[PDB]
Amino acid sequence: KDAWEIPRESLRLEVKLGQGCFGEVWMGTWNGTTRVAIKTLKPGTMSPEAFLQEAQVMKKLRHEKLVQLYAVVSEEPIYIVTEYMSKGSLLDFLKGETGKYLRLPQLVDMAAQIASGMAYVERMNYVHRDLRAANILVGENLVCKVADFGLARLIEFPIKWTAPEAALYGRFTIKSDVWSFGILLTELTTKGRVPYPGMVNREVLDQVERGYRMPCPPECPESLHDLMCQCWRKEPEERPTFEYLQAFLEDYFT
Ligand SMILES: CP(C)(=O)c1ccc(Nc2nc(C3CCCC3)nc3c2ncn3CCc2cccc(O)c2)cc1
């Protein structure tokens, strides 16, 4: 146990925002005053030690562009308490009505933020491994935080987002995340459309290995598509660093 623990009695779960195979996500209050989001462990899906691995990472990962860990209740049902993001996953937001009026600059701005969070994880020597629009949370003011560190591992699957070397040989490095990001970029620029349309798992992989890359989205500026191509380079070392991506994305409209 440790200093991140809080009494279960201090939390009032209220609305169920969504749910994953490994638990669920509820909106609630902490000590009556703080409105939070709690991720619970359904007694079946997996071992409590594992559900907690995610929180541990968050105990060490603290950045304004990463969802913030508030507290934990490691007594099963395990609760993981974090800040609350008013708009939910970026994916839904995009596929939603408010997302349809979003313009290039707003989109790039959001990309810039995600990149900022990732620039942190990068210099912190961790690898997220599950980077896609579904794992980004939109708070108030089109602010985006990065969630889901269930696969976050310090450098000692959703195939359509996973870099080939990682999907194939297990080489997960921050570079395979850069790959995932370029894919995320297509989601932003396509208003949440699915990567590699009409393609199945094995097919996607075979295509990418044969050098196939997604074409520049319509409505999407080549320069941005070029950026996506740097992310998708076959050579992990030829892929950009998040620090760069970030600087670049911020400077975009200039
Ligand atoms: C539908 P709507 C607009 O009323 C809505 C409004 C606000 C939100 N808000 C949120 N939705 C979802 C997820 C739960 C299901 C989808 C996103 N997750 C959220 C939300 N706020 C903070 N987290 C982080 C939860 C968390 C805890 C521990 C570890 C983690 O990795 C992540 C969600 C939906």
What is the spatial distance between Cα 205 and Cα 163, in angstroms, rounded to a whole number? 9
Buried b (16+ CB within 10 A) or exposed e, 22-34: bbbbbbbbbeeee
Angle at 245 between CA 239 and CA 249, to 5 degrees: 145
Picking from 30, 26, 166, 18, the residue whose alpha carbon sits closest to that of residue 93 is 18
Distances (CA, A) of 246 to 10, 74, 182, 202, 251: 39, 36, 12, 32, 9
In the annotation, is 130 catalytic? yes
Picking from 166, 58, 69, 78, the residue whose alpha carbon sits closest to that of residue 120 is 58
Please give the biggest Cα pair distance in the chain.
Answer: 56
Considering only the top CATH level, what class is 1-86?
Answer: alpha beta
Q: Which two tokens stand for residue 157?
A: 């699957």
- The SS3 call for residue 9 is helix
Does ligand 1 come within 6 angstroms of the Cβ of 85? yes
- The SS3 call for residue 16 is strand
Picking from 70, 30, 27, 77, the residue whose alpha carbon sits closest to that of residue 51 is 77
Ligand 1 atom with least separation from CA of 38: 27
The verdict on whether residue 22 carries a ligand-binding annotation is yes
Domain spans of the chain? 1-86, 87-254
Q: What's the CA-to-centroid distance between 237 and ligand 1, angstroms?
A: 34
The verdict on whether residue 99 carries a ligand-binding annotation is no
Distances (CA, A) of 223 to 208, 214, 240: 21, 14, 15
Catalytic option among 130, 148, 206, 226: 130
Angle at 223 between CA 98 and CA 253, to 5 degrees: 60
**In the block, which residue shows the tokens 């660093």?**
241
- The SS3 call for residue 137 is strand
What is the spatial distance between Cα 172 and Cα 190, in angstroms, rounded to a whole number? 27
Residues 87-254, CATH architecture: Orthogonal Bundle (1.10)
Q: What's the CA-to-centroid distance between 233 and ligand 1, angstroms?
A: 32
- The SS3 call for residue 69 is strand
For a pocket test of ligand 1, which of 24, 25, 58 has the largest count of ligand atoms closer than 8 A to its C-beta?
25
